[PDB]
Structure formats: C-alpha cells, structure tokens
C-alpha cells in the first residue's frame, strides 16, 4: 500500500510526499518486483535530498535488486557525484559487484565520470576489478577514449605518480595534460635531447656525423650492445647517435655527452634554448636511480614535450638535422611494448623510451595517423614497485586511450 506510494514518490522526486509517507510508517526498504528500493530509484534519478532522507530513515544503503545492482551502482551509472559521496559516507560498499561482476568503478570509468572515479578510488575501489567477461575499468576507459581517467587508473594500479602531456606539432597547442608540470626522472628519454645538442654542434660546423670517436674498454658501462664490439676501430658520431637512440647503448650516450661537456653541457644547451627545467646531472647508468624527491636528471612532461617540439619542428636545428633526429627516433627498436604495441596500422611513430629504478618508466614520441607525425606525446611514471610487464602494459593502455580519443 504505502510501499508503492513511497517507491513512486521517491522516483518522482516528490520530497515532501516521501517525508509524509515515511512519517505514516511506510517501509523505507520496500521493494518492487525486481528488487528496487526507494533509495535505488532516488539514486538513479538524482534526487539527492530524497537519498539523504531515505538513509536518515534507515534505508539499506547496500540493497540489491534481482541482478545485484546497489544504489551506488545506479548513481555511478547515471553520473550523480554528490549521491555517490552520500552513499559512501553512509556505508555503501565501494566494491559491490552485480551478478555479472560489474563494480561501480567499471561504470564510472566506462561512462567517463572523472570525479566519481576519483571518489571511488579514494574510497578504496579495487582498480583491477574484473567482471564476468574479463573487462577491467582501465580497459573500459581506454576503449572509450577516457585518457584522463585512464591515467588515474594507471596510477592507482601502479600505486605511483603518472604524468603525461599531448601537444599539437603545428601549433604547439596543449591538447591533453595530467601532472604535466611535475618532475619525473628522464631516464634514457634524455638521449633525444643529447642528439639534438650534437646535431646543433654539427650545424655550427663544430662537429661532424662522420668524425671517429675512439674509446677504451674502461669506458664501457651496462649495457654496451653496439659499442662493446668496436673497441679497436671506434665508432663515428653518427654511429654512436644511432646506437644511443635506437639500441639504447649507454656507453654511446656517455661518449656523445663527453663531446659537449658532460651532463653540465647538455643542461647548458637546454637552458640556452629556453628549457630552465630539464636538467641532466649524471651519466649512464647512474642517472636512472630515481631517488624519491631527487631533482637530479629530471624533467617535466611539458618541458620535455616543448623542448622536443622545438628540436623537431622549431628553428633550433636545420631541416637536415631536424629530419635526422626524427629518423633516429623512427628507427627505434627497443620500444616495442609501449606506444608501438597499440599503434594502429599505417600510423607514424618516432619515439624514445626509458626505464630506471623504483618503477621509473617513460616515453617521448612524435606520432600520428596516415604515416605522418602530428602530435607529441610524453608519458612518465616513477615510484611503482610493479613488474616490468605491468608497467609496459599500463603505459600501453594509456596510449590506447589517447589513440581512441585522437
């Protein structure tokens, strides 16, 4: 009797009628044919006031319908932030799963409710919750092209800071950004900047691609896949550049650094072209230590992205050197598992990845469809204790989101 009245009053957003009905002894936890309660319907319809009145009158905050949907599920599905928060405050199960394994975080992530994802994660939502069909929030967000949400889920999964930025090549317009102004260890991504500094000296006639560099077995550092094979005859600047970028040859990077005056030399080159943030302080491999709150050998996503854009399309380098820099990055062969792994057929990518200690991982890239680069993307993370496979996957999923949003 009063139950039908309360259910439709709650659904209809009739605040005063709900108060009257409950005051006349109506069952606050009455259920319809499918198990929906007044709280379900109020949460679904966005009736914040009524949601609060129902809970004040002792509504079951975690009531299930036939299919296991809770009020929180419905609020998440419908994007009613304030209601989500009230439900959690009143003891809503943040990790409640319906009959097919869907949690509220699946729904918030799928429908792109950024703030609701934030609130759910902070309330203790399991980021890697898998439904009956194997789907996870990160995967839903990525397939939907919700890149910002994807970054949040990656950070929660890795339990680490994640920074990224995406800018237009022609205009320089920042198109996407998360923690783009925070510092992250550069790792081997710095090598693209080193390359630019070398090419600059070449433009000035102070260096030659064909100049031969002789070094000793004592100069070798972990790892020296190319340089360790040419200790007798040495290698040209050109050959060292290719090895550093495309083969991540650390000794090659160090040898090229020496020619510009070490980490101080690169930092001076950077400062002089307008990057007052990016700094290199150490050589390979020590620069990858990624000590927490250590500003040595760090950049910000925007600083790196801006600097990289200036080298590739700006006036810092000649067209010849500009092209050579891009070419070295396109011929990158030690960056399989990140952006290249989720890049659609026919797309262009020129990139450089980096890995270090304390889950440090990152990538800089110029990419785009139709065989031409049209945007720069930079992604960094550090602090995670995750395995290397999980780091790679997480960053790949982040790129999978960006490509979807493209």
- Closest C-alpha to 284, from 316, 328, 240, 235: 240
Q: Which of 115, 181, 286, 295 is catalytic?
A: 286
The alpha helices in 79-124, defined as continuous H runs, are 81-89, 104-111, 114-122
- Alpha carbon 379 to its chain centroid, in Å, reads 6
Contact 298, 186 (CB under 8 A): yes
124's CB contacts (< 8 A; 6+ apart) are 94, 95
User: What is the rounded CA–CA span in Å between residue 220 and residue 225?
Assistant: 10
- Closest C-alpha to 391, from 60, 86, 399: 399
Contact 182, 161 (CB under 8 A): yes
The alpha helices in 219-292, defined as continuous H runs, are 237-246, 250-258, 262-273
* Burial class of residue 289 in the structure, from the number of CB atoms within 10 Å of its CB (0-12 exposed, 13-18 middle, 19+ buried): middle
Active site residue 321: no
DSSP state of 382: E
Q: In the structure encoding, which two tokens stand for residue 203, read together?
A: 């433009």
DSSP state of 229: G
State how beta strands 348-355 and 298-299 pair: unpaired
Contact 32, 20 (CB under 8 A): no
Experimental method: X-ray
Rounded alpha-carbon distances, angstroms, from residue 316 to 72, 126, 198, 302: 54, 47, 12, 18
Consecutive H or E run containing 165: strand 161-168
As beta bridge partners, residue 162 has 381
User: At residue 355, what are phi and psi to the nearest 5 degrees?
Assistant: -140, 145
**Size (the chain), residues:** 406
Q: Which of 188, 200, 353, 360 is catalytic?
A: 188
Q: In the structure encoding, which two tokens stand for residue 91, read together?
A: 């003891």
- Closest C-alpha to 190, from 302, 304, 361: 304
Active site residue 286: yes
Contact 292, 383 (CB under 8 A): yes
- Alpha carbon 82 to its chain centroid, in Å, reads 27
Q: How far apart are the first and last CA of the chain?
A: 54
Place of tokens 């679904």: 44
DSSP state of 193: H
Where do the domains of the chain lie, and which CATH numbers do they carry?
1-141 (1.25.40.20), 142-406 (3.40.710.10)
């Amino acid at each position: 009797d009063l139950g039908k009245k309360l259910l439709e009053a709650a659904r209809a957003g009739q605040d005063d009628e709900v108060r009257i009905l409950l005051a006349n002894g109506a069952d606050v936890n009455t259920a319809d044919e499918t198990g929906f309660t007044p709280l379900h319907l109020a949460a679904w319809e966005g009736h914040l006031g009524i949601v609060e009145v129902l809970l004040k009158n002792g509504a079951d905050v975690n009531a299930n319908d036939e299919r296991g949907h809770t009020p929180l599920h419905l609020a998440a599905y419908t994007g009613h932030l304030e209601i989500v928060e009230v439900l959690l405050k009143n003891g809503a199960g943040v990790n409640a799963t319906d009959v097919i394994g869907t949690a509220p975080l699946h729904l918030a992530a799928m429908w792109g409710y950024k703030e609701i994802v934030e609130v759910l994660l902070k309330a203790g939502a399991d980021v890697d919750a898998q439904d009956k069909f194997g789907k996870r929030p990160l995967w839903l967000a990525a397939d939907q092209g919700h890149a910002e949400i994807a970054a949040k889920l990656v950070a929660a999964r890795l339990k680490a800071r994640v920074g990224y930025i995406e800018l237009d090549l022609n205009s320089g317009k920042i198109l996407e950004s998360v923690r783009s102004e925070e510092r992250f260890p550069m790792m081997s991504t710095f090598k693209v900047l080193l390359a630019g500094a070398i090419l600059s000296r070449i433009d000035a006639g102070q260096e030659q691609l064909g100049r031969r560099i002789h070094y000793s077995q004592n100069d070798l550092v972990e790892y020296s896949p190319v340089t360790e094979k040419h200790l007798t005859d040495g290698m040209t600047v050109r050959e060292l550049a290719s090895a550093a970028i495309t083969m991540s040859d650390n000794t090659a990077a160090n040898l090229l650094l020496t020619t510009i005056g070490g980490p101080k030399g690169l930092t001076a080159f950077l400062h002089n072209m307008g990057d007052h943030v990016t700094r290199l302080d150490r050589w390979e491999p020590e620069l990858n230590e990624a000590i927490p709150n250590d500003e040595r050998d760090t950049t910000t996503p925007v600083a790196m992205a801006t600097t990289l854009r200036k080298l590739l399309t700006g006036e810092l380098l000649t067209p010849a050197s500009r092209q050579q820099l891009m070419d070295w990055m396109e011929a990158d062969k030690v960056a399989g598992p990140l952006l290249r792994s989720v890049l659609p057929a026919g797309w262009f990518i020129a990139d450089k990845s980096g890995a270090g200690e304390r889950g440090s991982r990152g990538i800089v890239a110029a990419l785009g469809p139709d065989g031409k680069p049209s945007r720069i993307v930079v992604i960094y993370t550090t602090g995670s204790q995750a395995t290397m496979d999980i780091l790679n996957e997480a960053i790949a999923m982040l790129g999978r989101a960006m490509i979807e949003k493209w």
